[PDB]
Design an enzyme around this catalytic site. Structure first.
Site, mmCIF file in Angstrom:
data_model
loop_
_atom_site.group_PDB
_atom_site.id
_atom_site.type_symbol
_atom_site.label_atom_id
_atom_site.label_comp_id
_atom_site.label_asym_id
_atom_site.label_seq_id
_atom_site.Cartn_x
_atom_site.Cartn_y
_atom_site.Cartn_z
ATOM 1 N N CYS A 94 0.717 -1.175 -0.090
ATOM 2 C CA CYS A 94 0.065 0.029 0.054
ATOM 3 C C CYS A 94 0.695 1.325 -0.041
ATOM 4 O O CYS A 94 0.490 2.023 -0.864
ATOM 5 C CB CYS A 94 -1.152 -0.018 0.874
ATOM 6 S SG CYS A 94 -1.170 -1.366 2.339
ATOM 7 N N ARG A 123 7.160 -11.022 5.800
ATOM 8 C CA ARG A 123 6.941 -10.757 7.113
ATOM 9 C C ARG A 123 7.719 -11.761 7.660
ATOM 10 O O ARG A 123 7.819 -12.989 7.435
ATOM 11 C CB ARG A 123 5.566 -10.847 7.232
ATOM 12 C CG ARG A 123 4.771 -9.710 7.018
ATOM 13 C CD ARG A 123 3.144 -9.685 7.044
ATOM 14 N NE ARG A 123 2.339 -9.077 6.227
ATOM 15 C CZ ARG A 123 1.259 -8.771 5.924
ATOM 16 N NH1 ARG A 123 0.301 -9.302 6.993
ATOM 17 N NH2 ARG A 123 0.664 -8.101 5.260
ATOM 18 N N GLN A 141 0.927 -11.544 -2.879
ATOM 19 C CA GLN A 141 -0.608 -11.124 -2.844
ATOM 20 C C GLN A 141 -1.160 -10.679 -4.197
ATOM 21 O O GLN A 141 -0.546 -9.884 -4.988
ATOM 22 C CB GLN A 141 -0.879 -9.806 -2.024
ATOM 23 C CG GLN A 141 -0.270 -10.327 -0.430
ATOM 24 C CD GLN A 141 -0.712 -8.843 0.374
ATOM 25 O OE1 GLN A 141 -0.374 -7.856 -0.004
ATOM 26 N NE2 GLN A 141 -0.961 -9.195 1.651
ATOM 27 N N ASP A 143 -2.950 -8.202 -5.017
ATOM 28 C CA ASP A 143 -3.389 -6.689 -3.996
ATOM 29 C C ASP A 143 -3.819 -5.848 -5.107
ATOM 30 O O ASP A 143 -3.715 -5.807 -6.208
ATOM 31 C CB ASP A 143 -2.079 -6.437 -3.388
ATOM 32 C CG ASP A 143 -2.306 -5.527 -2.257
ATOM 33 O OD1 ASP A 143 -3.494 -5.268 -1.914
ATOM 34 O OD2 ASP A 143 -1.479 -5.008 -1.505
ATOM 35 N N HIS A 145 -5.074 -1.400 -4.287
ATOM 36 C CA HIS A 145 -5.669 -0.305 -3.680
ATOM 37 C C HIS A 145 -6.471 0.552 -4.599
ATOM 38 O O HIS A 145 -5.903 1.057 -5.672
ATOM 39 C CB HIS A 145 -4.368 0.389 -2.966
ATOM 40 C CG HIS A 145 -3.862 -0.568 -1.928
ATOM 41 N ND1 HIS A 145 -2.705 -0.988 -2.266
ATOM 42 C CD2 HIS A 145 -4.184 -0.770 -0.617
ATOM 43 C CE1 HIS A 145 -2.400 -1.776 -1.415
ATOM 44 N NE2 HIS A 145 -3.335 -1.663 -0.287
ATOM 45 N N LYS A 225 -12.349 -4.566 8.179
ATOM 46 C CA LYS A 225 -12.019 -5.580 6.971
ATOM 47 C C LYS A 225 -13.503 -6.395 6.733
ATOM 48 O O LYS A 225 -13.706 -6.906 7.758
ATOM 49 C CB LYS A 225 -11.101 -6.563 7.185
ATOM 50 C CG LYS A 225 -9.742 -5.923 7.629
ATOM 51 C CD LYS A 225 -8.448 -6.650 7.524
ATOM 52 C CE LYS A 225 -8.383 -7.802 8.464
ATOM 53 N NZ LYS A 225 -6.885 -8.535 8.263
ATOM 54 N N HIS A 271 -8.339 -1.226 0.290
ATOM 55 C CA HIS A 271 -7.492 -2.305 -0.133
ATOM 56 C C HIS A 271 -8.097 -3.563 -0.220
ATOM 57 O O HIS A 271 -9.108 -3.865 0.449
ATOM 58 C CB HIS A 271 -6.613 -2.649 1.316
ATOM 59 C CG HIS A 271 -5.909 -1.560 2.108
ATOM 60 N ND1 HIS A 271 -4.638 -1.363 2.379
ATOM 61 C CD2 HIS A 271 -6.353 -0.253 2.409
ATOM 62 C CE1 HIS A 271 -4.208 -0.284 2.970
ATOM 63 N NE2 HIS A 271 -5.441 0.475 3.144
HETATM 64 C C1 LIG Z 1 -5.323 -6.439 1.329
HETATM 65 C C2 LIG Z 1 -3.898 -5.694 1.458
HETATM 66 O O1 LIG Z 1 -3.926 -4.530 0.609
HETATM 67 C C3 LIG Z 1 -3.529 -5.185 2.851
HETATM 68 N N1 LIG Z 1 -2.411 -4.105 2.753
HETATM 69 C C4 LIG Z 1 -2.990 -6.460 3.453
HETATM 70 O O2 LIG Z 1 -1.597 -6.988 3.171
HETATM 71 N N2 LIG Z 1 -3.890 -7.031 4.160
HETATM 72 S S1 LIG Z 1 -3.625 -8.293 5.290
HETATM 73 O O3 LIG Z 1 -2.759 -8.125 6.174
HETATM 74 O O4 LIG Z 1 -4.762 -8.558 5.921
HETATM 75 C C5 LIG Z 1 -3.096 -9.684 4.230
HETATM 76 C C6 LIG Z 1 -3.863 -10.078 3.086
HETATM 77 C C7 LIG Z 1 -3.731 -11.166 2.278
HETATM 78 C C8 LIG Z 1 -2.581 -12.017 2.635
HETATM 79 C C9 LIG Z 1 -1.847 -11.524 3.862
HETATM 80 C C10 LIG Z 1 -0.804 -12.633 4.337
HETATM 81 C C11 LIG Z 1 0.118 -12.450 4.854
HETATM 82 C C12 LIG Z 1 1.376 -13.305 5.405
HETATM 83 C C13 LIG Z 1 1.203 -14.650 5.210
HETATM 84 N N3 LIG Z 1 1.836 -15.503 5.274
HETATM 85 N N4 LIG Z 1 1.320 -16.884 4.739
HETATM 86 C C14 LIG Z 1 0.130 -16.345 3.905
HETATM 87 C C15 LIG Z 1 0.090 -15.094 4.389
HETATM 88 C C16 LIG Z 1 -1.055 -14.121 4.103
HETATM 89 C C17 LIG Z 1 -2.115 -10.682 4.617
HETATM 90 ZN ZN LIG Z 2 -2.915 -2.590 1.277
#
Ligand SMILES: C[C@@H](O)[C@H](N)C(=O)NS(=O)(=O)c1cccc(-c2ccc3n[nH]cc3c2)c1
Ligand SMILES: [Zn+2]
Ligand SMILES: C[C@@H](O)[C@H](N)C(=O)NS(=O)(=O)c1cccc(-c2ccc3n[nH]cc3c2)c1
Ligand SMILES: [Zn+2]
Lengths: 403, 398
Positions: A94, A123, A141, A143, A145, A225, A271
């Site tokens: 983002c 992460r 992702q 992803d 925005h 969310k 998002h």
């Molecule tokens: C949707 C995005 O624009 C938002 N900035 C985001 O990252 N949201 S989120 O943290 O909830 C999210 C969304 C999708 C995947 C993950 C995520 C994060 C870490 C992971 N490790 N293994 C599978 C994983 C998935 C986190």
């Molecule tokens: Zn985001």
């Protein structure tokens, strides 16, 4: 239990090693599936009118302090330094998307601006929580925005909601449960802003006739969310999709646009990710099909075999012809007997297996077999090509003729 | 004509002080990047390369075994988790060897050609960063070829032919070939380097390729053929490269069952055709001065109205061209037709299709090019066919 880690070794899709915890080594055939999923998402990005960008893997810690991530993600962020400065490897796409928005003057006429990325994020997840493709440290992702006015929230959240159900239906996921994740304990933004963001998402769900439950204290630090969980053919729940309403990060990052009355305004940001982690989505799919991927996703769609040395030249001609027609085809010219060859490709779950004996050479036809043991008999090559092209184009779930 | 200025004018990308040497690809620049990946994929399909993807970081222990830690430390970004140390990858080779090392290989599997669009990072000194040409985060069109001693000639030849094949598509007139020999800090014996350096010179000579020596500039693991391309000020940039490595496979325990059932270590050939995708885009930006060939142009066609009266028709053709695979956008704005033409000319959009009342009745389009040439009236089928042909053949002109 069905296990993608076992199916994936059987089908030579990917591996993991302790040299790179929670980070996938994609073998040829696994990467073929990942690339086809990206082709599919891109078709949807085109139809739904998204941009596609790519933001950098790392940016200065100072920017991540500004967003609120440093306070709220510190522990989960990988840091690296060069020449007296510290950078974070990106846990989210983002902030990069905002930096791209911030280039040049934006007008209300530029909105809604829908910005997508196959965003490669990292992460520092605790080692004890990692699991195959499902729980990783480096994930990708699907992803995006969306930058919009407050007046546009309704239609844009709707478009995100459609996209979720649209995309999950392609893979045969029709049973979907929905939740609204409300203010966490550690959050940024005033309670009135939160009151407003939560109501905005509830109202969208209500107007779509989507029932939901609350998920107390599980929203992001920046906004609440809508979270979508699909059930597979074994009725297991997988939380995948997310739609998030953010009244905080744009202001924090000095994002603005000139409105109709030429006043300066801060955009709202939505998002969303439909598949979630593509790694995780492939893991789920591998278990859902138990390795029997639909033809459009199968790493190898067709194998053509000779009976012996006699028909090599003909099988080579056929392989080339099917390949030009865009099919993932390979030739099996080996020593062995016909039954050794077909067993191998049957256990690799190759959709179709073409057999080429003396009589096929002279007729210009092929004897067609499937991975579920069906004998489709003699077929003309052009018929075979056309029907596979149709199966692939339409991203059909099942092979030829069945229920 | 500077790629940095052109980059801004066509809205292809940007950089900021918050990430020195890290590119933010805007939609239109990412469009170009993606076409280049498509093109690379087509060329590697005819050569049977697999395509893989390896991890962004691996344990310091692995980088110590390859010799990167001793020969490549200041150039690597490092990070830590749970008291283990990782290098962010500067190269994709070690990851490819980890994939090769999965499952028993035999001579029957060789040559094994393994490609990756590999996103790497090197901590390049800040004073040496220059636009898209020298960045810290880069993507290589990389591959490694695992082979026997007897297969080196053929496989090196195959890489050389791929470089001139792909480069012909863009029409480069100046491709300078350097052979880079053993550096001061290096791994492997002098005998290995004698034989590695000889194989690459022999290969150039076998193809009758004029070349110069660039002493002391090869990689720590082996000598490099370099295919050099030049920017608008005639500064040299390494693009294509072909390298011979008798060290890394042993260091990483790679092996295969030979013809005679003894274990053997394979030879590795490293190569990139385009080089860095970022550097190559920089080169192409200046080479074409922004006028990218139709197949690469981020927006291939813009369709414009004069007034609201033709909108329905412009939308009609915009969906028709889009459905035919053409990168098309509608310009429906309450702006004068000469303002519209000038923006899209400046954006280097190969074709502009203008629609007034006249075109709505006739079912045709008025067609103008970014070179200001008037192409007159044309039928929509003839424009769709012309363009699909220019795109499919990837033509440089017209
Ligand atoms: C949707 C995005 O624009 C938002 N900035 C985001 O990252 N949201 S989120 O943290 O909830 C999210 C969304 C999708 C995947 C993950 C995520 C994060 C870490 C992971 N490790 N293994 C599978 C994983 C998935 C986190
Ligand atoms: Zn985001
Ligand atoms: C061919 C590869 O398999 C090889 N292991 C390699 O990295 N060789 S290389 O170091 O010479 C090389 C090849 C291609 C691109 C780059 C490169 C490396 C860093 C860069 N910053 N900006 C542009 C850059 C380009 C280096
Ligand atoms: Zn290499």
């Amino acid at each position: 239990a069905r296990d993608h880690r076992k199916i994936g070794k059987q089908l030579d899709l990917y591996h993991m090693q302790e040299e790179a915890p929670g980070m996938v080594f994609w073998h040829n055939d696994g990467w073929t599936i990942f690339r086809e999923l990206e082709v599919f998402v891109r078709s949807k990005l085109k139809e739904y009118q998204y941009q596609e960008v790519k933001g950098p893997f790392m940016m200065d810690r100072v920017l991540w302090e500004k967003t609120g991530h440093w306070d709220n993600y510190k522990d989960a962020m990988f840091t690296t330094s060069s020449e007296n400065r510290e950078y974070c490897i990106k846990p989210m796409n983002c902030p990069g998307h905002v930096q791209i928005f911030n280039q040049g003057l934006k007008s209300y006429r530029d909105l809604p601006l829908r910005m997508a990325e196959f965003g490669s994020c990292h992460r520092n997840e605790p080692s004890g929580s990692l699991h195959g493709l499902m729980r990783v440290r480096g994930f990708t992702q699907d992803d995006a925005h969306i930058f919009c006015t407050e007046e546009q929230i309704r239609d844009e959240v709707n478009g995100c909601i459609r996209l979720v159900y649209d995309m999950y239906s392609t893979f045969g996921f029709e049973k979907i449960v929905v939740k609204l994740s409300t203010r966490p304990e550690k959050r940024i933004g005033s309670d009135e802003m939160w009151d407003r963001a939560e109501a905005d998402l509830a109202v969208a769900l209500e107007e779509n006739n989507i029932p939901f439950e609350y998920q107390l204290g599980e929203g992001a630090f920046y906004g609440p969310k809508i979270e979508f969980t699909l059930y597979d053919c074994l009725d297991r729940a997988w939380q995948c999709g997310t739609v998030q309403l953010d009244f905080s990060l744009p202001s924090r990052l000095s994002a603005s646009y000139v409105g109709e009355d030429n006043e300066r305004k801060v955009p709202v940001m939505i998002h969303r990710a439909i598949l979630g982690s593509m790694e995780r989505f492939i893991g789920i799919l591998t278990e859902e099909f138990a390795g029997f991927f639909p033809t459009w996703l199968a790493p190898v769609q067709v194998v053509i075999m000779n009976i012996t040395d006699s028909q090599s030249e003909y099988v080579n001609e056929l392989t080339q012809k099917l390949s030009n027609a865009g099919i993932r085809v390979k030739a099996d010219l080996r020593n062995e007997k016909i039954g050794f060859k077909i067993r191998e490709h049957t256990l690799r779950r190759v959709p179709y297996m073409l057999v080429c004996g003396d009589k096929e050479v002279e007729s210009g036809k092929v004897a067609v077999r499937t991975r579920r043991g069906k004998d489709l008999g003699s077929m003309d090559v052009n018929e075979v090509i056309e029907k596979l092209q149709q199966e692939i184009r339409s991203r059909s779930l099942k092979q030829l003729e069945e229920l």
